[model samples]
Target chain A: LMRILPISTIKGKLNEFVDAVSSTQDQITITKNGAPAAVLVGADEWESLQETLYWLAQPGIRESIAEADADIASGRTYGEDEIRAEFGVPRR
Target chain B: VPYTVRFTTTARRDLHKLPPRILAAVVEFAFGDLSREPLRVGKPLRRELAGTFSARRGTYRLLYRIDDEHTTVVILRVDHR
Candidate 1:
């Protein structure tokens, strides 16, 4: 493991580290004020974070929205009205 | 570099307490994902009598001010904590 260090990391260092990890698939460990702060890994690792956001953004993702709409339109799915009614929400 | 978004004080405060994802979206919209442009997380938008946007999580409201001088969108707030 190459122990690379960043100077004045408050601004661009994180970006530099991200770029490094994205390209080299290397793991970078960041330390702030002589203490370990963060770690940067390859895309595969970042994908977990991305996937969580994608899931939460749910049925409205920029790229996959059409897929979601299709899935909803089919009776193989549910609608806002059905779910809201099931939960006893007002029909407004 | 310059103040592109002209906003009321209330609009600034309202943007502060935004949820993480909305905050992330706002930042991504401002600073591109792959672009190396630096972003400074500024003060939140204050409640104003100007404009409104959909509330994502009911925690924050997206608001903005158009800079007529530069024809830019100044997003005021996305509020949560």
Candidate 2:
């Protein structure tokens, strides 16, 4: 579960709040004027989420995945030796 | 002050798509100059990219953020101009 705190409280205890979010990976929801304002999450979690969003943002990924799945279903995939030879990868 | 530089996964992926020479130049610009003084070296972005900073190298733009609390400069993107 995430922690909900008012912005004023966070402002007074910024370091302590940061420690809670960073050290414990606690997601803190900050409220402003009795409404949802922003969220504070660990750096690692934010980075991972950003990366995932970036990858998903790439164009034609769903189409590309569907095509690859079709090829797999049709047994049109290459073996290790075939890939190595085709791509000039070391066979040994 | 010497700030530790960190590359976001998106930034790393973007760097991988560049030619070796371009990559070398970008790396050198980031570490040799940007890390030393990110705020002074880069311009602040606006709108949706607010609070982030960006530096230019030829046709490429390097986006990053300076985290004072961590003494780190997080490289967010390597984008073409």
Runs in model 2 with CA error above 4 Å? A1-92
lDDT of 2 by residue, B1-81 (tens): 788676654456667787766766676666667868887667655434445666766768676667799777766567663
Q: What CA RMSD would you report for each candidate?
A: 16.2, 13.2
Model 2 chain A lowest lDDT segment of ten: A83-92
Residue B78 of candidate 2: its Cα lDDT? Answer: 72
TM-score of chain A of 1: 0.36
CAPRI-wise, candidate 1 is: incorrect
Candidate with maximal TM-score: 2
Given candidate 1, what's the lDDT at residue B21?
Answer: 57
User: Per-residue alpha-carbon lDDT of model 1 for A1-92, expressed as tens digits?
Assistant: 44645546636666766677776536766678777777767674354344334333433222332332343245233223442343343332
